[PDB]
Symmetry: C4
Subunit: 31 residues, 4 copies
């Protein structure tokens, strides 16, 4: 459970990374 | 635990957003 | 909990979708 | 529950794979 929250956090932190990599690809293609 | 269900919701919702990003990308590539 | 498993399943099913959309973009760019 | 922790692991691992896809993409775009 405290380990669950650690894994939740890693999961969110990967999910913002991915959002953000994707946002930068969309920006580039749209240039 | 509904804290854990809460987190799963928050997860999916991020994944929905990610899928919208990729729908924009795919259009910009004419898919 | 049975609802947790439902949300897990949706989460996996979005994650394979995303993997797969991404695999098809990589294929296209690499052509 | 370690079934739930198990699932979270399986989640992250998919997200790692997704990040590898996007590293290939980004290179193909010369980022
Ligand atoms: Cl939901
Ligand atoms: Cl892990």
């Amino acid at each position: 459970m405290k380990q669950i929250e650690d894994k939740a956090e890693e999961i969110l932190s990967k999910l913002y990374h991915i959002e953000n990599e994707l946002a930068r690809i969309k920006k580039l293609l749209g240039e």
